[PDB]
Design a protein around this ligand. Structure first.
Ligand SMILES: CC(=O)N[C@H]1[C@H](O[C@H]2[C@H](O)[C@@H](O)[C@H](O)O[C@@H]2C(=O)O)O[C@H](CO)[C@H](OS(=O)(=O)O)[C@@H]1O[C@@H]1OC(C(=O)O)=C[C@H](O)[C@H]1O
Ligand SMILES: [Ca+2]
Length: 486
């Protein structure tokens, strides 16, 4: 048969926010000082798994990522070019896409989704106050996902988005809303343990399972004890700011900097929650039977580059996501600088569960399962992964976004981060970031393009290839045709 799979992906979690990057072996495999975070469960897990230094969120923003995650397609084809909200009818997960849940399901898996989905355009949808939005907030951010639209998940315990961490809410398989008054991650984790124990007979123990856990923290808020457990907070409470924010690209004097205490608390708590899932696998013997992956949708600046916006930028702090894959006696624990792109996750996870031959044709990403199973595999490693920023385009008579402005395309290679920003009226180069991530890992030194013709010309060629391959708007609109060979 085919093994079980759990994909645990807390929102807004930097690859750099993991203890083990300062630990022996690991710390020699990355250019950065890891954040001073206490993540013991993940640290141990990392010594059992293939660990990437260089997984990329091509569009480091919730819905765009989730769209690539679930469909294995870039944001021009996922259905999901923008963050989902009542402003953006143009952005919602394609009904007609053959998603990760659909393939698993079609192959005999029970599939179960816990926590944040943030992939559907809000509608007056609400199962229990019908013809009504699920919240009053305008714009509307949250959404209910009916059985018709759950792409293979026969077990639902999930919201769209809602950032009260100790007052989260969930719709069950039947559309019943639940409001425990419990810190999201530890509730989500207890709820997963129950599904694993098959309490309430919610699952067929003869079928293998596919689980996704979309934890909200360590995403905003992170201002107070409303937003994390005092237990975790106690570790960072009194620590001076210059010993929490160690990245030399940080402005310690930003109103935001204080938030690091609570970010790290949410990180330590998320680790404790992941811990409960792992122990439940061991205590039930499912540990030997199950592919486990720890990931995020995008990172967090946390005052790095004075950005104030956690993400939606090409900085290593925004693009680089954790990616840890444990599959006992199929994957040797090791570190790998594979440049995995989000749309590669779905086909690679199917590869790993031996459903490589069931990858839908519409999928744009590639199946690196062979490379996970075999260090020494004749498989081509990517040269780069695309940077993508998509903004609101034009609006209609009723003030709704009905198109997207592709504000930035760029590339991350082994050595370089390049990001080109264009103007909405005159599709002309307006700002340009270029970093030598090897010599300038905190991206302090923005390199002029004119002073680097050999390097830039190569980056322009790799962007061209990739943008043409995914049939990206920059390609179809022959944007910067004058520097980018298509
Ligand atoms: C972090 C941020 O800048 N904006 C995100 C937003 O965060 C608000 C929270 O709801 C609140 O808890 C916190 O303390 O302050 C934020 C605020 O009031 O501005 O939450 C959104 C989801 O609930 C969303 O995050 S997302 O799910 O992770 O990706 C939002 O992200 C911003 O969204 C957009 C966009 O819709 O275009 C653009 C920004 O680049 C992105 O940072
Ligand atoms: Ca997010």
């Amino acid at each position: 048969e085919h093994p079980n799979i759990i994909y645990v992906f807390p929102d807004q979690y930097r690859n750099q926010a993991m203890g083990f990057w300062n630990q022996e072996g690991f710390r020699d495999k990355v250019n950065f000082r890891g954040d001073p975070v206490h993540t013991p469960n993940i640290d141990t897990f990392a010594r059992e798994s293939m660990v990437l230094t260089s997984a990329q969120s091509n569009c480091p923003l919730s819905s765009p990522h989730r769209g690539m995650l679930l469909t294995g397609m870039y944001p021009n084809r996922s259905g999901v070019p923008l963050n989902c909200n009542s402003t953006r009818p143009i952005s919602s997960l394609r009904d007609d896409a053959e998603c990760i849940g659909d393939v698993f399901s079609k192959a005999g898996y029970d599939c179960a989704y816990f926590g944040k989905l943030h992939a559907d355009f809000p509608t007056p949808n609400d199962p229990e106050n019908p013809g009504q939005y699920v919240e009053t907030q305008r714009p509307v951010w949250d959404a209910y996902t009916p059985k018709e639209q759950r792409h293979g998940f026969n077990y639902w315990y999930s919201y769209g988005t809602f950032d009260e961490h100790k007052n989260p809410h969930y719709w069950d398989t039947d559309g019943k809303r639940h409001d425990p008054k419990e810190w999201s991650p530890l509730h989500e984790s207890g709820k997963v343990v129950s599904y694993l124990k098959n309490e309430g007979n919610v699952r067929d123990t003869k079928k293998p399972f596919f689980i996704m856990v979309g934890m909200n923290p360590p995403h905003s808020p992170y201002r107070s004890l409303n937003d994390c457990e005092e237990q975790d907070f106690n570790l960072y409470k009194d620590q001076p700011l210059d010993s929490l924010l160690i990245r030399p690209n940080v402005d310690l004097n930003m109103k935001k900097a204080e938030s690091v205490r609570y970010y790290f608390a949410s990180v330590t708590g998320v680790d404790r929650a992941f811990g409960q899932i792992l122990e439940a696998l061991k205590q039930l013997g499912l540990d030997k039977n199950t592919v486990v992956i720890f990931a995020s949708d995008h990172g967090e600046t946390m005052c790095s580059q004075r950005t104030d916006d956690p993400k939606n930028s090409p900085y290593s702090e925004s693009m680089n996501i954790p990616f840890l894959v444990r599959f006992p006696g199929k994957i040797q624990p090791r570190v790998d600088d594979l440049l995995l792109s989000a749309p590669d996750i779905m086909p690679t996870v199917l590869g790993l569960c031996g459903l490589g031959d069931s990858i839908p044709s519409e999928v744009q990403g590639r199946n690196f399962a062979p490379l996970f199973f075999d260090e020494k595999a004749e498989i081509v490693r990517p040269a780069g992964a695309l940077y993508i920023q998509n903004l609101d385009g034009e609006k209609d008579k009723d003030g709704l976004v009905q198109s997207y402005f592709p504000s930035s395309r760029g590339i991350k290679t082994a050595r370089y981060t390049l990001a080109l920003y264009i103007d909405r009226k005159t599709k002309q180069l307006k700002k340009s970031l270029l970093f030598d991530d090897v010599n300038d890992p905190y991206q302090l030194n923005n390199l002029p393009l004119d002073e680097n013709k050999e390097v830039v010309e190569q980056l322009y060629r790799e962007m061209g290839t990739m943008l043409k391959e995914i049939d990206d708007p920059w390609y179809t609109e022959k944007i910067l045709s004058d520097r980018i060979p298509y």
